[PDB]
């Protein structure tokens, strides 16, 4: 489909674990902070370099009701000296571009071609809706016909302080059908 050949990288491939070598049964899995209609995944304090690193921090966002708004916060490099120097986020074009599992690897997909009727506002408060500024947002539509799963990454595992290593953030947005 055209418009996809112009916005996504068809050659991109990654995995949930990345280069951490941690299997999913050893992830630190936890649920998003859900308040009213807003489900939030905040990695502000989850990814700092630790002795045991690299760890995988997976935030699970489970949606089965309409008009839910998802906010994801990924600390910027420089926010705290030394701790996020090598932090990276994927896709760079989030939330317009997301990762979906094709076969057994994560590849790029346009979120608007995945959850139709989605709303992505260009701004988050006064900021740009992009991990470049530290936070992304999108609002799911009143109706979803099919189960959908897509991922975001906020990886500080390549950052090293002392002998400590940062953790790898993962967001899984599991949108079960709703609205009939």
């Amino acid at each position, epitope marked *: 489909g055209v418009d996809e050949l112009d916005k996504i990288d068809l050659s991109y491939e990654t*995995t949930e674990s990345g280069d951490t*070598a941690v*299997s999913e049964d050893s992830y630190d899995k936890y649920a998003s902070q859900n308040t009213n209609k807003e489900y939030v995944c905040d990695f502000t304090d989850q990814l700092k370099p630790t002795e045991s690193g690299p760890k995988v921090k997976k935030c699970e966002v489970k949606v089965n009701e309409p008009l839910i708004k998802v906010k994801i916060i990924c600390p910027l490099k420089g926010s705290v000296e030394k701790l996020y120097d090598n932090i990276e986020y994927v896709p760079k074009k989030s939330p317009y571009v997301v990762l979906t599992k094709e*076969e057994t690897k994560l590849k790029e997909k346009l979120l608007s071609k995945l959850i139709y009727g989605l709303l992505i506002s260009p701004t988050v408060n006064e900021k740009e809706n992009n991990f470049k500024e530290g936070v992304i947002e999108f609002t799911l539509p009143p109706v979803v016909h099919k*189960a959908t*799963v897509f991922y975001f990454i906020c990886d500080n595992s390549k950052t090293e302080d002392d002998n400590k290593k940062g953790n790898r953030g993962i967001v*899984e947005v599991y949108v079960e059908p709703y609205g009939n």
Partner: single-chain antibody
Amino acid sequence: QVQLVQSGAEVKKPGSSVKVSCKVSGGTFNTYAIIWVRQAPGQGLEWMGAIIPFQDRGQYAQKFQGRVTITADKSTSTAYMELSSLRSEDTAVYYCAKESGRAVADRWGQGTLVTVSSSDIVMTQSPASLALSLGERATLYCRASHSISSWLAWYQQKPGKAPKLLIYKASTLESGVPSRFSGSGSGTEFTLTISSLQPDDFATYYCQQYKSYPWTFGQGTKLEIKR
């Protein structure tokens, strides 16, 4: 840790159907792929299909298309592989496996014996067999007919057991694998090396590409002790 439990053995007549179950306990079931691989008696491994349960639709190898169904019951965390129009040639041990976020199938069921009685990447492995003594350096070769980048895994299979993953991404050792194992290669030529052979090493080793379905295996290298 994750455990996959399959249904019991089954004897079937030619032309009938068989359904093998696979119960996953521990870990997450709905968003990770379940794989089905069979192995005829004394033969190599053969990928049949896969399924990510939340999608409710499976993917299949052309050999079995129109003849097999892979389902998943999310309420019981149980995957099924149903194979119709059975043959004597379908006599094999059928394994289910699961990927765990590292793309490779690193969790395997015990296998289920089914006896029937009344443009794909080609992996080439050498030597077919290797006879060495303890303390000696072992070197196994594996070639891919098309570039697979670094999406290559090395399995150790003892008799009667399921494949055990030793190396993924060409050279990443699975946890618990001793350092005397090492992997190397990129593109089309890969090697598995055992720096000093130990008693537990003598088995049959397979390489497998997981760049693209249908996943394909080499015919293995039987590494046995020298007289």
